[PDB]
Amino acid sequence: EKDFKRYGDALTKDFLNGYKNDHAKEIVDGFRSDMSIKQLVDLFVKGSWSAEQKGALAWEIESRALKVTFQNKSEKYNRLFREIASAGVVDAKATEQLAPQLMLLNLSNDGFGGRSDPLSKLVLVAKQLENDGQVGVARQLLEKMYSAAAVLSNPTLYSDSENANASKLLSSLAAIHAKNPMHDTSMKVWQEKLEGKQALTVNGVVEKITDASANGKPVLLELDAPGHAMAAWAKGSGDDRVYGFYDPNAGIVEFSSAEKFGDYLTRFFGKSDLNMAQSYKLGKNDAGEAIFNRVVVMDGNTLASYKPTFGDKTTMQGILDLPVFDAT
C-alpha cells in the first residue's frame, strides 16, 4: 500500500472546486465510474493532475468511503451473528436481517453509473408503451433503480430472489451497453441518424419534438453528447399531447405546453441557467451553436422487440417488466 501513503502526502481553491463541481468523468480522462477506491488511488498518484482534477478524484474516493462508513455501523451485529451461525452446530434457519439507520445510495457507481445510453433507450421504449396505453412505465423503471440500489447495499433484508432480481436489472443494463442496437448486424432499431452536417442543436431538437406535423404520432429521440446519452419524446394526441426530456443524471420533465418544453431545454443546455451543453461538452456546428454528436430517431416498436443478450428471449420491453421485489 505504497499507493495509499503516496496519495496521503500529495493531498487549494481549485481543489474545492474540483471536489464539489468539477466532477471526474468529463475532466479526468481515464476515470471510469466502475472504479474501486484502490483503482482511483492508482490513477491519482500514477498520473499528473491539476488541483481541480485531484479535487474531483478525492471526491470519487471519499464518497465511496462514506458509503462504507455508514454500512459499517451494522458490522458489529453482522460479525456477532456470523461467529455464532458458523461455529458449532448447523442451523439451516440461522438468519439476520440488518436495519441500518443510515444508507448512502450512489447511483453513479457500483454498477449504476456508465448507463446513460441503456437508460435513454429503455425510457424511449417505455414512452412507446405509454403512447400505446400503458401507464407509468418509465417512472417505474427509475423507481426500480433506487430499489435495486437499496437491495445490493443491504442484502440481508431482502430474499435471495430479490437479490438476484436486483443483480439481473444491473446486468440487463450492462448487456445493452455490451451489445448496442446501433452497432447491430441483424435488425434496424432506428428510422434515422442525424449527425455531421445534419446534426441538431437544442433548438432543432425542440422543433423535431414539438412539430405540429407529427401530431397524433410518437416521436422518440436519443440525444448523444460525446460521453453521455439523453432522451426526448412526444406522445399522445390533441390536449393529451405531451413533450418530454430525460437526462439519466437528472430525471424526467414533461409538458403539454410546447413553449414550456422549449424554454426548459433551452435553459437546461444553454448558458442562461444550467449550462449543460458546456458541461456535457457538446461540439459546435458551422455557426458556433452547440449540437449533439448524434440524434437518433427511433422506431419504438422495433426497439421494444430488440434482444440485447444472445440466447435470451428477454426484449427491451421485457427488461422494463423485470421486478426487484417478489410478487404479491
Start-to-end C-alpha separation, the chain: 49
**What is the C-alpha radius of gyration for the chain, rounded to an integer number of angstroms?**
23
CA 56 to chain centre: 19
Distance CA 160, CA 182 (A): 35
Residues 200, 249 share a domain: yes
Q: Which three cell numbers mark 232?
A: 426526448
Residues 66, 149 share a domain: no
Tell me, yes or no, whether 305 lies in a domain.
no
Distance CA 53, CA 17 (A): 9
- Residue type, position 173, single letter: L
Residues 33, 12 share a domain: yes
Q: Strand 251-255's sheet: what is its strand order?
A: 190-194, 294-298, 219-225, 228-235, 242-247, 251-255
Residues 228, 169 share a domain: no
Tell me, yes or no, whether 103 lies in a domain.
no
Domain residue limits at 140? 116-179+310-320
Distance CA 51, CA 188 (A): 46
Asked if 135 contacts 311 with a C-beta cutoff of 8 angstroms, the reply is: no
Count of residues for the chain?
Answer: 328
**Torsion, Cα of 301, 304, 309, 310 (10° steps):** -30
Residues 131, 36 share a domain: no
Q: Determine the angle formed by the axes of helices 160-178 and 116-131, rounding to 10 degrees.
A: 100
Residues 291, 207 share a domain: yes
Tell me, yes or no, whether 78 lies in a domain.
no
Residues 257, 225 share a domain: yes
Tell me, yes or no, whether 63 lies in a domain.
yes
Resolution (A): 2.4
Residues 38, 19 share a domain: yes
Which one-letter DSSP state was computed for residue 168? H
Residues 220, 196 share a domain: yes
Distance CA 18, CA 35 (A): 18
Closest CA to 125 of 113, 111, 108, 140: 140
State which approach was used to obtain the coordinates: X-ray
Tell me, yes or no, whether 105 lies in a domain.
no
SS3 assignment, position 167: helix
Tell me, yes or no, whether 196 lies in a domain.
yes
Tell me, yes or no, whether 96 lies in a domain.
no
